[PDB]
Amino acid sequence: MTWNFHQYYTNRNDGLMGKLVLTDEEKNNLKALRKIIRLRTRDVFEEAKGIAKAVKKSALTFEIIQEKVSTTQIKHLSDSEQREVAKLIYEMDDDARDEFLGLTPRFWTQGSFQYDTLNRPFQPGQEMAIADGTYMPMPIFESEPKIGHSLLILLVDASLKSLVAENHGWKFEAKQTCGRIKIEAEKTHIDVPMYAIPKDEFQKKQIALEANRELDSENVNLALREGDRKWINSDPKIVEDWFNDSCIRIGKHLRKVCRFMKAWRDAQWDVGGPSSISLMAATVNILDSVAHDASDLGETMKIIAKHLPSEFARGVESPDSTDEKPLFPPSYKHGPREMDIMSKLERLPEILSSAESADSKSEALKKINMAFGNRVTNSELIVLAK
Secondary structure: OOEEOHHHHHOOOOOHHHHHEOOHHHHHHHHHHHHHHHHHHHHHHHHHHHHHHHHHHOOOOHHHHHHHHOOOHHHHOOHHHHHHHHHHHHHOOHHHHHHHHHOOOEEEEEOHHHHOOOEOOOOOOOOEEEEEEEEEEEOOOOOOOOOOHHHHHHHHHHHHHHHHOOOOOOEEEEOOOOEEEEEHHHOEEEEEOEEEEEHHHHHHHHHHHHHOOOOOHHHOEEEOOOOOOOEEEOOHHHHHHHHHHHHHHHOOHHHHHHHHHHHHHHHHOOOOOOOHHHHHHHHHHHHHHOOOOOOOHHHHHHHHHHHHHHHHHOOEOOOOOOOOOOOEOOHHHOOHHHHHHHHHHHHHHHHHHHHHOOOOHHHHHHHHHHHHOOOOOOHHHOEEOO
16 A cells, blocks of 8 residues: 555645644634734833934933833833933933934844745644844944933833733733743734834835835844843844745745644644744755755655755754854754654654555555644545545
8 A cells, every 4th residue: 555645735725734824713813913013112212212302302301211111001110210211311422312302223033934844833832933123223333232222121121011011811921032921821922023124214115115016135134032142143034034035946835735744743842842933944945956846745744754864964054144053953962852752753744654655545544644743634535546
């Protein structure tokens, strides 16, 4: 016996894609959540700007400024955080205060929601994620921009915390690269990294955009929450463009197989396993260099599973040239975490082979479900090879 799994993988109702692709409820939910954060963040920034402009209008004391702060949504910060915001607004010099009054936060979602490879969570504790970056158009800087790193972080945190304060079952979490809202009961969290981008360039492109119906990566700076290094050059559009380009170059099946590999990962580890981006990059390298047939994703997945251990062993380069660190280290550097990852990857082609030569459709299903978990239950998707 030899079985074909193309329908197992791709059927949009009962097949693996049918089980991975977010429901409408889930997808509209994530969009509603993102919209809610965007609205509050713009509101919080206006409230702060309103105070700034009152300082510009007439020299207000520091005590008056603390008073005004305490009545805005910034009141959801800690009392030390609140006075920190008041101090920063009070201390801003004329140049910085003008720039701040010009600042309007802009938004852009990154990650799997944007790559369109966001899977429904499998194991308990696994969550849907969405990252919506907040971008701050400001003059080009080195060291520190006119509008402080500190002030920008506090206002974004104030936005998130004001939303948490309005929602039972929401929780705020501060991370090194973002603020986070988690809604455990909805298996959802939203990340908000903050970026500085050149203002003059942003304005120029925006005018052309509206007239005709991207920014220079080197000056896109990710804010870091702690440590000596407040900013780092990091442009999420690099990876985003690379992946979209890869999809065009390889074909529409690229997104499906990346979903399958992420689903494999979610089934093999409740927590941990290779990052999604290392799997996508390794898969892209394989499909770029190995002949395969998109009309049979059963066969294509066997090709992928066969070549992934070699990809990971030699180490997986980031498609972003400016990242020094690989997405995954080469063998001579592997510790326990990577060794565990190598063992799982080496097992995959064995699993897919045993499914292919199972005695029946029901056993073929059980065997391939060792790789992806028991999500697909309709064994009739599995057909005899011709």
